[PDB]
Assembly symmetry: D2
Homo-oligomer: 474 residues x 4
Amino acid sequence: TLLINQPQYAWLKELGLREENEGVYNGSWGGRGEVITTYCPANNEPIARVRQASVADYEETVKKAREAWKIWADIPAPKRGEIVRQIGDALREKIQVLGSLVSLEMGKILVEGVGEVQEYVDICDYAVGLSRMIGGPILPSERSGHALIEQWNPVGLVGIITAFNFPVAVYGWNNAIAMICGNVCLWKGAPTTSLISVAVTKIIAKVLEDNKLPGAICSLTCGGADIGTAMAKDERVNLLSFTGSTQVGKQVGLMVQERFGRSLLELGGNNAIIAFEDADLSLVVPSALFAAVGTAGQRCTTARRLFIHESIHDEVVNRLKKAYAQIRVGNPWDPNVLYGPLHTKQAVSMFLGAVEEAKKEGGTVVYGGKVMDRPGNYVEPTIVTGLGHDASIAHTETFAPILYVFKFKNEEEVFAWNNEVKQGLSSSIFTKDLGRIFRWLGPKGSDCGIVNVNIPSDAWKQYMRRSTCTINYS
Amino acid sequence: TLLINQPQYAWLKELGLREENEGVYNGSWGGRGEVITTYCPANNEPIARVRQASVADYEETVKKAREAWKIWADIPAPKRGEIVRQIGDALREKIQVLGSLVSLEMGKILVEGVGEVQEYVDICDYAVGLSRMIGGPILPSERSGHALIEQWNPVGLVGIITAFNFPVAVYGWNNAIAMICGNVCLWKGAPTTSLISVAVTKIIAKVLEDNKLPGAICSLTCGGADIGTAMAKDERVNLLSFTGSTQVGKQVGLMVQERFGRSLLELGGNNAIIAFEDADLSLVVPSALFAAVGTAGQRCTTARRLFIHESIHDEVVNRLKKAYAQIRVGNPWDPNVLYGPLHTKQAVSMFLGAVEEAKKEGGTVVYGGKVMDRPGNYVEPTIVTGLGHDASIAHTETFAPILYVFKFKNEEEVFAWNNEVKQGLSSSIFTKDLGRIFRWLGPKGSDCGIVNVNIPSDAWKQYMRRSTCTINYS
Amino acid sequence: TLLINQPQYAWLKELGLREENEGVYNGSWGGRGEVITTYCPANNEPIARVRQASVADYEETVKKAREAWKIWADIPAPKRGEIVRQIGDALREKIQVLGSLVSLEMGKILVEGVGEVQEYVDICDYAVGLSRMIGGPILPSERSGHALIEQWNPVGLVGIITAFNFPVAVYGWNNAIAMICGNVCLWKGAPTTSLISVAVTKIIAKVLEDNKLPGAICSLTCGGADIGTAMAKDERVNLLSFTGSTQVGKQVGLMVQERFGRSLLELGGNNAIIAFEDADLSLVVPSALFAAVGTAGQRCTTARRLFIHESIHDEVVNRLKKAYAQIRVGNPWDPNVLYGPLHTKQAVSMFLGAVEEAKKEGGTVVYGGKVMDRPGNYVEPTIVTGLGHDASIAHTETFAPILYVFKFKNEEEVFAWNNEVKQGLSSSIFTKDLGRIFRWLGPKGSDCGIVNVNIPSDAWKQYMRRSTCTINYS
Amino acid sequence: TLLINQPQYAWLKELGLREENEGVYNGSWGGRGEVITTYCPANNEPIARVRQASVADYEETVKKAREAWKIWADIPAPKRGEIVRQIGDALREKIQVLGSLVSLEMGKILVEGVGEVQEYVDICDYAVGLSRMIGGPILPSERSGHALIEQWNPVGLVGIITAFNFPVAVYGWNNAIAMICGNVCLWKGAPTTSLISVAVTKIIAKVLEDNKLPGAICSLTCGGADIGTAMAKDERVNLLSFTGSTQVGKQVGLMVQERFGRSLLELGGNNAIIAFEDADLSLVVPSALFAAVGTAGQRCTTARRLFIHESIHDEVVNRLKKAYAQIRVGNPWDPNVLYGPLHTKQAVSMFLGAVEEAKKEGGTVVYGGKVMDRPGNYVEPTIVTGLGHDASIAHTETFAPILYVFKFKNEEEVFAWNNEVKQGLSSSIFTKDLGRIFRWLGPKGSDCGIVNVNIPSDAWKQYMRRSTCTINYS
């Protein structure tokens, strides 16, 4: 029986959810496509159902969004910023129940579900001020009586495809910034977090309707691969923002390039931590633990490779083992719990596969490595030593809490080893040597977009199009 | 026999050119690939020969450039700017002979040849100042004792592929900005402007060598499509800047994306002029003429489509015909010609094909349309009326002076036609209606990247990679 | 008897006001200086009393603020922004009662009282975003191994002196931006709006106190010119922001300069409207009316001089007279009045003096010019014709609704008259001539800081000090 | 007899100088005021004569500059930047002789005279690029159909008053930036460096005249106190840029404030060096020496106070004594010489006075302290120990090479001692403690505008005026 039909989960109805929900919003609610059931990863019970978009629903929604854009693009950016401010206030009023839904459907612990909603609230508050800073300079012409203007305009329709692991705040960032820039949006979220997508859209829809604005400014089309592919191939989708796996992202990027569209791609990464001989182990150990096991290793920034100087390798592994042993496991919406389930059964199979393969490649499991014997998708947070830097399994991004640990002797080799990795998202070094820190942050250092030391505002231009306008008034 | 072996072309030796030239530079000169002879389009006589890159040459050059980068990236940006300043000065000293070579090999009139070199000089002067301005903010962290830094680093090796029609200045822009940003460059120019590529590289190489810097900072590998394809597929080419046809650019874009590289594409676009009922015809007629036939219609920005309101259509066409009859076509060294020969014999065939296709599609040639019976690649400036706005040949960019003229009645009408084309590069409107001007430049107006009215500084970020660095110093 | 002791004014207690109020806040409330009673200008009845700062109070407050700064300056800018966000929310919760107080004590109509508080709320919303944007670049040094940093730090204590006519929002802007910049503030408001100053400070103090921050971050010392002079002469006041009369502002400026302090002066300016021959009169007439009589002519931006081309002068004056006759003047709580009483009885005498001086200088009162025979400080909206452009009384800013009207023939003429005045704050031109518009806004046009056409984000740097830091880490 | 009349100094005539020179330029050369003789500080011989501006000359020159501004302000900023580029090229051609004149008339060593001219050249090269970056944003209005524009215009006439110690490059900075911003300038230099002012103006005048521009764009009025005061009090001087002593600067600032003008003041400072217990003495000692004795202690940034940790105090003083003993003294235009004369006889008297007074206040001269027995104004570079931090003579800025040395025990007291100083221009710390460095650069650290560690681009907005322009086109 559906969780939403059980009295203990009646709080779900505060988000406007029912046993079966419409998964399309374009000013009207609908959905003629496949009906999907989403499940609670803590107990594998079905929560509720969502009727997804058909291709015809998607078509109509794109057309309705483009019609709504005619109205929206004529609203001054500071007034669009006021609408975004009101969305933030509306999220604020629902923060506890929406955060609880994030924990229930996605599986992250409650402080993180609430924290993700709060992040969206903070984004809306930030967007208010940003809405007053949109614009380009009037530059000096080389010709007398000519005005040279850098003009910024909305791209039009921004399609947004998001992933399971941050089912609220990635959409929130894209939506808030795209809205103040005068764009309309179309959201297709992860199918396994459909209820979260519907709940967020219900909150936004009410703000838009209360303001007598066309709802399609923030459209929703829940769906699977066919809807995602339709967006990637659709010339009416002027900008496609995608967050997800590197293999899928590459194909999305190629499809958008094939039609000369625009894309923003946020793809995976291996994240590494490097602890040198002079590191503060009182920072390293808890940093590595939270970076490795936070959200059960399902963050885009999850640490999966830990390089440790030979002199401290054994001690750090030991202290990690101790720390891992204190991790508190349970239902992720229970305020006492520090560690929840993996998001899907399939993730558990990947976890088991990765562990056995690491063994086969010569690795030693020094902690964990097993599925936990309890309902839901719980696995033990795992530490694997003895693998070589090159090990193929250690470069595959398995969204599970497996930490691969490597030893190194000097700065030269460890830097070389890391600079041989491609997708690298973030790099965290722990050292007290200031010169070494400069080398790692500089041109010859990490190639990562995020670099951290002793720790684990033209954003709007990405959602607009620039023109150079020359006016002769002489 | 080669022009360079004739006494009146002895000035070419001031550029370090010979009968047979090396087309590879990486600190040393060489070339084991195929020879290419380039021709003077004013008389169809061979100028001199260039030995192009083989695969081995390309491999060695990429390797030497990446080694040169280890030195270059360590040189402070303002000092890199001083090198670029010295390149500007060296171009200055050669401006007459280098401008004459551009005229000789490419075919543009001397004032434009010299003017293109002057643009590169001005770019160098600009870059000196820009080199003291590159960098990012230290931003306040939300956490006490944490520093948040926006870091900008060179991408590494910047591949630059350029086209025949601006064989100096497009390279110049890419090179100057890439250089001050701490990158090394690899240039593959248009094969038919190989001598120009060699001459520019000899000037730059001397500055680098005099300053005791490895010459491969600004490498050259002359070649055709096989070198271009190598660059697009090469993971060691961190950023590929491509200027040229839309069809080729799409392929380049797809290849670079397939390897998750970075690309900067400057692709074709048609250019339209729109004359509304209230236009100043004494502006419209000369603007249209010069925009349509400048550089024999071979600019990326050449006006090929002219839309005229019904009420002034006949008059504007009559006055254009009268003005066209006064266009003087001839040798690039003649100070009294408006334009010279087309770049290639093939371009002449293209011109004839377009003129015939225009007639087959129902157009009327009201002026020009013929090849001139003289040595070289000279064609008459041509005007075609009567085509429908959607006629295929008028949407084809033919690099020749052919102007297609269309009649319209309403603003809604002409806007729809114009924003029915996709690749559109520039839009020039002639009107006195201020409301109309704002509409055209605003969110619901032209989608071109360039919009002009009554006429026909974060660029460095494109050549660098951004990282967010967080430093815990608490 | 005091209005606050009458039952219908019990709402004032929601603002924490009493019969006798403390006018000093520095973490605690006090006041040993002279008492001041403020009056409601709608009925000339006393509202309540405030005990102002003595010299000892001012000394203690400056000392406590500088001690509070040691704590505040260590709080990260984004966290300071969150405090300012909470101030915005606290103002929101009190917006109706605080707006009513502004109406009661200052005399502006309720929609403007509420609207002024809303502006402070919007400023707080803006500042939240701005707090994440403050900082300077790391710039490339010309020397290897050297880092060049543009550092921004709080100036320290920011003294804020404000005027009667915007007794909330001017303070609000200064305070919000100063706060996110890491400064502490000391407020001295207009004595006749002391209750408003106390009420605003009670709202802010509660946020500070609830957040366990020393209240002297936003200190208040109510007082008259002797407190203002102390602030201007005080070396411990690092930056003095002054809003008010030109004569007083000059003195403040001189005193601050004498001690090499920093000042921000927002001084009087006259505001002119110029209607050219081609002006849309259906814009001109209401624009002039609302600009001239809004807030009973007591805004810094109030239009006091209207220049009309000879060809439309009589017509515009006739239509203004007709429109003026429809202006409804009355109680600030009446939703159907355009403006209410002048702020003081003295302002009424000033109004009468100006009207008489205007006649002595040869002007004709074509409408208004009289005091209304009712309780409170109510005067008729007034129009004066016939004065010469240089007439002394028309260059005097009288904070009352008196509009002086001048006739002109040429553009050169009216421009010369207008740029013969020095203190000019705003210039509003009405015309359809695009060339004229560019001239007026360009280098040879109006010298006003505010220029409007057909209508009547580095600000934070003003509140911080810049340093250039060079770090040799080689 | 005049140096310029002796054959050994005939190189002066390459700068267009004669035995008597016109000291006024406004498009014409003139000067009806007092005739001044300037002297060579290395031998006290007269060089040549300059006829300064009378009050009538000043009046006419102001009027001529304001007339020239009408032309200049209409020239597009990039073309103004081209003029500034040409000035840089003209300085380049004269760099050796102009640098020699700086050494001859001012007294700084030849590498510094040449280096100062090169600085002006570098400024011109920088200004070229800056000229393309002048402008403000078009911001979003809160009202539909309204355009909000941040407009920047020239202030008009910029008066520039400069000092003896950098008689070329301070003017150069002010002139170059003021020119690209569309202003005209009026220069009054130090009377004792009049020949340098005339020589620089001759170079600039030729560029302007070759370009058919009115010479008064860069006017010169050589003169003493009366001309300086006239500029300070002149309402036609829209911006007054002053560089010089704090006492004179304060009065200039007050005079400009009295007339509501604008000023840029660059005033003196005490510069301190602080060497902590862990400092690299191999950096400290040579840093202190060059900072103390460079330009014979006549720089605005000259180190006059050296705080040294008690543990290393004796060693650093000893090593300084050794280093001081190797200083090479002679004629400053002799390429072998490291140390020249003080600029005037009067400076020698100040030097002697300061030394005797330091003795009287209880200080010990451990090196130097005497006038050198040779022609010219040579004094011994001097080190004074034993004074207390509070010592009055050590806070007086005597433009002579006297280094006052203080001992300290811990970070708290030395920071307190330095933060008790007012005019402080720069602060240089030597330490390896990173936390201490952060404290000194942060809000609780140095109040100086320049802070250096282990070592001794909206500039244009200062020369323009901002307006907020609102355009209603609806």
